[PDB]
Design a protein around this ligand. Structure first.
Ligand SMILES: [Mg+2]
Ligand SMILES: [Mg+2]
Ligand SMILES: [Mg+2]
Ligand SMILES: [Mg+2]
Ligand SMILES: [Mg+2]
Ligand SMILES: [Mg+2]
Ligand SMILES: [Mg+2]
Lengths: 130, 80, 198, 83, 156, 136
RNA sequence: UGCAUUAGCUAGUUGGUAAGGUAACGGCUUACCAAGGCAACGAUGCAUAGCCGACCUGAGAGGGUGAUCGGCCACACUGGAA
RNA sequence: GUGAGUGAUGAAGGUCUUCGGAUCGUAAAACUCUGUUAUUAGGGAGAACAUAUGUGCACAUCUUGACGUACCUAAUCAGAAAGCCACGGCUAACUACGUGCCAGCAGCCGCGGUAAUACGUAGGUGGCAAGCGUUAUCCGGAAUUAUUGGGCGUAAAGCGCGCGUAGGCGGUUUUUUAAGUCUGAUGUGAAAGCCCACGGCUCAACCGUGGAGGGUCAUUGGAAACUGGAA
């Protein structure tokens, strides 16, 4: 395995075409905030968290729309092993006219572009989801 | 107004104060944004302070007093 | 000047556009030598050449100025296709064909050369100005009347809005840059808003 | 050696002037130490006196010289006998 | 009522035992100016009514374009086949900036303010389908809040 | 390619094959060296005229020359004109742009150029291939 | 800035102690002592080019220029030394 | 600005003509209209500052023009705003005559082997403007060098396949660090120029004023989620 969270977060799309509601993950400490800022912003019905031994289980329980429209409709990893990016707090980009919500590891943990203006901090912006 | 304060390892040493100081540093490339690392081989002089294979110690630039060495400090912390 | 026949390019385009009409007393079919035939189609090149060229013969300025008045129109605030229509009226020759001096711009756009060409001070012997809000284009002091300007001042009346002149001085410091409503109506702004932009 | 600039700026056929701490051997548009104001030499200006001389107070208080017959603009100021 | 603009025609042949025989194809696009756009393709041995043969084929299916007030909501790149378009919103007074075919599906639509550029190929049968695909992928700014469960204010 | 093999051997733009290759260069008299100039036109004197026929879709037969320029870079340049000139040992002024379908000419001859002012029996060409006597 | 179809360069060359000498330290010069120092993070070699705030283009990233007008070098028939 | 309000198909004469009539064309006269150019005029903007005497180097008061065209005013002429290039499509611009794979056009596809709207003229039309067009160099169009922003089955493109050092990247957790990272207090990136605001040049070209705004930096404050660094 080469990237600890790209292999995670691209099981979401492959578990978003064929319309599951299950996905099991190798959990971490990082992802137990990642899948909750997607629980804070509606994109997941219910993640519980890792509840087993030897850094084991993690399940997600996704969310689909009313007439079986997929809700998470777009997904992107941008800051990568092999090429980091680091966006300062002045030129922080919005995602799809601000509809989608990026996410950033900064001096106060992982926050988003909702929180990139009250803190006026910057960090490694790693994803874009829409 | 102060001297330089660069720190870093060595390669080896020979007779008469050949305290060469390897320094490693990061830079971006100017276009592609990759974090490329590179070194620089420096020089300073002392009595018998260092030896081969690991003599990381700060140096400080001064008046030249050599043909290539332009640092006057061998203030030692880490070694073998 | 144009040094040509403006009643021979009043049917080669669609309009005399400087009076009421000079095409009903002629063959209004086509320009010449192919008038006894049909009419073709029109592309977007037909849009640019028909509209820019149908507006150039209404303010008689030659080209290399059209771009200069185009970004001179552009270097401002608002909608561009409205603002070229806002700076279409600041020319004193336009106020010398629109404040009832003479009809055709060959004589009416010659109103700098011999007449009441003073404008709140010295004379302005050119074909325009940057005549902003609050400035009077008065009469000449040694002659407040030429031949044609006072002899045909009583020939027409009921002039345009956003201008309020008087008699016996031929002077106006009236309002401002005019409205986008009162303008030359027969043009399409967006068919020429990208024609000199592409 | 330090002097005060009177250089030929502006549109041609309209010789203007800018007032700055100059040197006797560097030319008109040459190397400039520091600015010392300007003056409208246009002879068509009512308000013209542009010398905020608190940033030019160090010149004549550390070894300046008068400049090349600009002395009547040195007349409209008064900075001498203060020391 | 409804406006119907021809984008292009083409003279299309077929070889049989004798000389080859011709027929004209003519795709047309039908716009309704409130943001509902269809398109169709005509195939007959004449110009001036194979147009109508396509126009009756165009109204049978439409797409509901998301008008934001004089514009499009966000940035999208609808591609279909090798051709592609680059769509981008702009200020309310801008005009429309597009190529040949991809303004015949925008001014015949009701958007009037887009910066755009074609990419990839340039044959007019692949431009329009990728543009319509791009307009289907666009979403309103309120139904995202509906499936999200947020309000409109909570996103900003 | 990935970034490490892209900061190692970087990008490298395409070559620029240039039109009019037999130009832009002045071979010096004293120092006897090629140079670079990027010059619009050059002089030259003529050697042959001739006319080769075939232009396989075009099929007429037209003339040519072998001028050689300042400091002897010999060339084949095409003469525009229904008529011609009557001069060996000319003082031409050549011009770029390839008259196609003749394999081996990329160059013109400007009519006039202080050797022959073109053809006299042409009126409404009036700058191409050397006419005069217009007062339009 | 371009060449790996240029891969081994350097011998007061790289250090030490002196002796001098220069406005000033110093392998700057000589007396010995020794072994170094540089390099696939492109040394050396050939070829071309005076640099820069700027100018032209470009939506932006970038690409191409260097006479005007200013900053700083280097040079005055060619070479040396006061 | 080399002309102006008029001015009945308006013309003698060019072209189309099957000619009956459109076209140049309200073009033109010949009336009526004008000083820009031409003979004279006062023609006098930058144009300042001291080797002195009265007061105690500072104040007021007497000392300096090469271009002498300019601004000016005032009679008032018609002195050439002409010529370039095209007209099949890209890209607005159409008819006749000699010519017949010839002589010849050509950015590109291509036009002429007898009726060429692509040759050479004629007339008309289109774009221009005191020029037009051509050859030459750079950028975009070109995402045809693709970090934003391309690909490698058959289209150009996978080493014949191992074992491997230099270099590149790395699972899970807890601690400390602070090189990369994020942030703010300074010193600095001169002025002339570009970007908008303002004064002046009969407006314009052009000038002066205060700001973006001068990049990787410099030193300490500061935050410690991720990449290093060590247990
Ligand atoms: Mg020179
Ligand atoms: Mg043309
Ligand atoms: Mg021809
Ligand atoms: Mg490709
Ligand atoms: Mg292996
Ligand atoms: Mg290894
Ligand atoms: Mg400060």
């Amino acid at each position: 395995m080469t990237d600890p969270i790209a292999d995670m977060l691209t099981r979401v799309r492959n578990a978003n075409m064929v319309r599951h509601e299950k996905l099991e993950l190798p959990a971490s400490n990082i992802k137990k905030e990642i899948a909750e800022i997607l629980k804070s912003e509606g994109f997941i019905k219910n993640v519980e968290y890792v509840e087993d031994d030897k850094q084991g289980v993690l399940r997600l329980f996704l969310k689909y729309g009313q007439n079986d429209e997929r809700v998470i409709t777009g997904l992107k990893r941008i800051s990568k092993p092999g090429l980091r990016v680091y966006a300062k707090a002045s030129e922080m980009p919005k995602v799809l006219n601000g509809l989608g919500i990026a996410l950033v590891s900064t001096s106060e943990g992982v926050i988003t572009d909702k929180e990139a203006r009250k803190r006026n901090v910057g960090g490694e912006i790693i994803a874009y989801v829409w | 107004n102060d001297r330089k304060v660069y720190v870093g390892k060595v390669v080896s040493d020979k007779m008469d104060k050949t305290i060469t100081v390897l320094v490693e540093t990061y830079k971006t490339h100017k276009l592609y944004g990759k974090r490329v690392k590179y070194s620089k081989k420096y020089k300073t002089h002392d009595e018998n302070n260092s030896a081969k294979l690991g003599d990381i110690v700060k140096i400080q630039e001064t008046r030249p007093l050599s043909a290539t060495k332009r640092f006057r400090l061998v203030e030692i912390v880490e070694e073998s | 000047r144009f040094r040509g026949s403006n009643w021979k390019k009043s049917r080669r385009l669609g309009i005399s556009l400087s009076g009421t009409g000079k095409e009903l007393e002629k063959r209004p079919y086509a320009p010449g030598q192919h008038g006894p035939n049909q009419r073709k189609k029109l592309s977007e090149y037909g849009l640019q050449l028909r509209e820019k060229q149908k507006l150039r013969y209404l303010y008689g300025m030659t080209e290399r100025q059209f771009r200069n008045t185009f970004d001179i129109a552009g270097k401002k605030f608002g909608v561009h296709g409205e603002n070229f229509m806002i700076l279409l009226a600041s020319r004193l020759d336009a106020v010398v064909y629109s404040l009832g001096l003479a009809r055709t711009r060959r004589q009416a756009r010659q109103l700098v050369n011999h007449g009441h060409i003073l404008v709140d001070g010295k004379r302005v012997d050119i074909p325009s100005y940057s005549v902003k809000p609050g400035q009077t284009i008065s009469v000449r002091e040694k002659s407040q009347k030429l031949n044609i300007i006072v002899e045909s001042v009583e020939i027409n009346n009921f002039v345009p809005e956003y201008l309020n002149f008087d008699a016996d001085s031929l002077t106006g410091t009236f309002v401002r840059l005019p409205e986008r409503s009162e303008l030359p109506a027969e043009i399409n702004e967006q068919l020429i808003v990208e024609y000199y932009s592409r | 050696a330090v002097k005060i600039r009177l250089t030929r700026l502006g549109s041609k056929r309209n010789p203007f002037y800018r007032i700055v701490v100059a040197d006797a051997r560097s030319p008109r548009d040459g190397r400039i130490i520091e600015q010392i104001g300007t003056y409208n030499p246009t002879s068509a200006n009512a308000p013209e006196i542009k010398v905020d001389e608190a940033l030019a107070l160090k010149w004549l208080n550390d070894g300046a010289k008068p400049t090349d017959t600009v002395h009547n603009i040195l007349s409209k100021e008064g900075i001498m006998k203060k020391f | 009522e409804f406006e119907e603009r021809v984008v292009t025609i083409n003279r299309v042949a077929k070889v049989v035992k004798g000389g080859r025989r011709f027929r004209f194809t003519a795709l047309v696009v039908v716009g309704d100016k409130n943001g509902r756009v269809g398109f169709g393709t005509g195939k007959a041995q004449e110009v001036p009514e194979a147009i109508k043969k396509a126009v009756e084929a165009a109204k049978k299916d439409l797409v509901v374009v998301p008008r934001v007030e004089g514009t499009t909501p966000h940035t999208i790149t609808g591609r279909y086949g090798s051709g592609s378009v680059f769509m981008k919103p702009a200020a309310p007074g801008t005009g429309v900036i597009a190529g040949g075919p991809v303004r015949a599906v925008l001014e015949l639509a009701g958007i009037t303010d887009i910066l755009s550029k074609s990419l990839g190929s340039n044959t007019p049968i692949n431009m329009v389908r990728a543009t319509i695909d791009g307009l289907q992928n666009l979403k309103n700014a309120e139904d995202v809040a509906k499936l999200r469960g947020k309000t409109v204010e909570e996103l900003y | 390619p990935t970034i490490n093999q892209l900061v190692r051997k970087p990008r490298q733009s395409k070559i620029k094959k240039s039109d009019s290759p037999a130009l832009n260069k002045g071979f010096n008299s004293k120092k006897k060296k090629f140079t670079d100039l990027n010059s619009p036109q050059k002089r030259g004197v003529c050697t042959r005229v001739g006319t080769m026929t075939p232009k396989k879709p075009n099929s007429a037969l037209r003339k040519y020359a072998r001028v050689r320029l300042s400091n002897n870079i010999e060339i084949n340049a095409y003469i525009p004109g229904i008529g011609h000139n009557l001069q060996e040992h000319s003082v031409v002024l050549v011009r770029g742009g390839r008259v196609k379908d003749l394999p081996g000419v990329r160059y013109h001859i400007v009519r006039g150029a202080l050797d022959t002012s073109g053809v006299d029996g042409r009126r409404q060409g009036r700058s191409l291939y050397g006419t005069k006597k217009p007062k339009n």
